[PDB]
Design a protein around this nucleic acid. Structure first.
Ligand SMILES: [Mg+2]
Length: 95
RNA sequence: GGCCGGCAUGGUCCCAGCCUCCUCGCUGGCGCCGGCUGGGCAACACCAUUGCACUCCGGUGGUGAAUGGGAC
């Protein structure tokens, strides 16, 4: 069962060999155009490696971002995107 | 990274080179053999991982390393 639209896009199948700092930057480099970005969260832990949460300020941005970049080659691997299953705290602390 | 034993080995500097998970270099180290033992995944490598978070957090490996020339 797919997910409902969200301010945060969840991406996976990301090249795990990239360090956290560089990955956040490289990601912001290709997604900042779809709209303001509140934050990007990356973890290289066993459970969270290869994944990232790009938190957009406006749902439309995430939505665009989702349709446009789906499957985009990044660090030699086809990005896989979805909407986050739930709101990120940064969002809750507001709407 | 640290430690011990055995054997071998004239000396002190100089230049160049090379070595390394553990005070990366010129007031580290760069004969041979055997064994004892600590830290840490930070980097690098390999294994495993396709994983939905907002709590930092998988594992194993490396020193089982590296030479020549010159001056007294
Ligand atoms: Mg690791």
């Amino acid at each position: 069962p797919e997910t409902r639209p969200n301010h945060t896009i969840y991406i996976n199948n990301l090249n795990e060999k990239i360090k956290k700092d560089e990955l956040k930057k490289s990601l912001h480099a290709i997604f900042s155009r779809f709209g303001q970005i509140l934050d990007i969260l990356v973890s290289r832990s066993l459970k969270m490696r290869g994944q990232a949460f790009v938190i957009f300020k406006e749902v439309s941005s995430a939505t665009n971002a989702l349709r446009s970049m789906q499957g985009f080659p990044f660090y030699d691997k086809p990005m896989r995107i979805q909407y986050a299953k739930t709101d990120s705290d940064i969002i809750a602390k507001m709407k």
